[PDB]
Amino acid sequence: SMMIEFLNLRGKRALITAGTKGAGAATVSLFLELGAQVLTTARARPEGLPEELFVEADLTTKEGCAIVAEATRQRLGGVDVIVHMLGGSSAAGGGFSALSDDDWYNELSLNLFAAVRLDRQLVPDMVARGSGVVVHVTSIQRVLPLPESTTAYAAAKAALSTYSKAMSKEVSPKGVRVVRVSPGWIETEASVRLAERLAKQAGTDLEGGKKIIMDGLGGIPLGRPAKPEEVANLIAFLASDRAASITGAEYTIDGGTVPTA
Template structure:
C-alpha cells in the first residue's frame, strides 16, 4: 500500500530507534519515520539481506538482558542519544493450548520479549530525554492485551496487558519532564509473522489457512472494515503520534484495529 507522503520533514533532526525494525510493522514504521526526516536506527537479532537506504542497523537480541547495554552504548556513541524510541519488538512465541501447555520458560520468554525489553530500553534512554527536555516513547502493544484468547494468546495477552499498564503509569511520571509516552495497539496486520501464526494454527486444526483466517476474524468479533491492516497504515498512526502534531497526546492507548475491538 502506498500513501501520498507529506513533503514537510516534520522529524528532521530527530534520532529514532525502532526495535524489531526489520520486518512487518517495525519495518513500515522505520520507513515512515525516515520519510518524515528522522535519522532512523533499527535493531533486530539478525541483519536482513537488504536494508533501506538511510536506515542504520544495530544487531541485538533484546530478549537477552545482556544485549541491552551494548545497544545503548552504540546508539549513544554514534548518534548522541534518542529523541524517539519505538518499542515495537513483540511476538507470540508461546505454544497454543491454554494454561497447561505453558511452562515457566514459555512465560519468561513472552515476558522478556513483550514487556521487559521495553522496560530496559526506557530505563536506558529516558534520562537523556529528560535532560534534553523532551522526547517520545511509543509502546507497540496489541488489541490482544484487552481481548485475550485462552487457547492461542494467553501468555502474549497477559504480557501486553502488563505493557499497557506500565506504559500508562510511565506516561504519568514523565509527562511533567517533557517526555510523552503513548501506546499503540494494532489489531490484525498482514505481516509475515501473522501469516506464520495462522499457518501454524491451521496445520494444528487440520484446515486451510484461509479457513483459519476467517475463524480468527470471527473469533475476535469481526473487523468492520473487512480486512487486515497493511503495516503501512499502522506506521502512519505512529508517525503522527511522534510528530509535533500530537504534542498534547500522552498516556493514551490508540487502537488501530479497523473497528474490531467491540467496546465503547
C-alpha cells in the same frame, strides 16, 4: 500551490526496535522518508538494510539491551523518539495449563522486559533534555485476551500498557510524551503462514484460514487485518510535533475489533 510540510520527523533521532519485518520494517522505512535519523535492531541484519542504520542484538537479554543502548548513545548521540516494536508470542496452544515457566519468561522478556530495560537506560536522558516521545506498541490482547496460546502474551501486554501509563504520569510533566499504539491483527508474512496452517488443519483454504483468525477475534468490522504501513502511519503521527498534546493514551488500530466503546 506551494507546500508546507504538515507532518514530518526532520531533526529527530529515532530508535525503533525490531524494525526488520512487518510493521517494524514499515515504520523504519516511513521514518526515513519523513526525515528522521534512524537506528533499528534485530538478531539478524537484512542485506538491503545499510549497516549504519542497524545494530544486531538479542533484546530478550540484558546484554542485548545494553548493546542497543550503547549504539543509540554512540551513533545518535541522543534519542528523540523511541518506538518499542519488539513483541510476539512463541507459546504453543493448550491454554493456561500448558504455559511453562519458560513460556511465561519468554512472553514477559519479549513483550515487556526489553522495553523496560531500554527505557530505564534511555528515558532519563530524554527527561534531562526536556523533550522526546516514547511509543510502546502494545496489542488489543492487553484488553481482549485470547486464551488458547496467548494467555501469557496478553498478560505481558497488559503489564506493558499499565507501565506505559505510569511512565507517562512521571515524565509527561517533564516534557517527554509517552503513548501506546495498540494493534489488532497485522498482515505479515508470519500471519499468512498462520492462516495457511489453520486452513490446512481445518481443511479449508487461505480465505477460510483468514476467517478462522478473524472469527477467533470476535470479528473485524473493517473486514481485514491492518497493514504494516498503516501501523507505521499512526506511530509517525504520534511521534511528530502534530501530536504535542497527546500523552498517556492508547491509540487502537484494529479495524474495530475491540467491541467495547
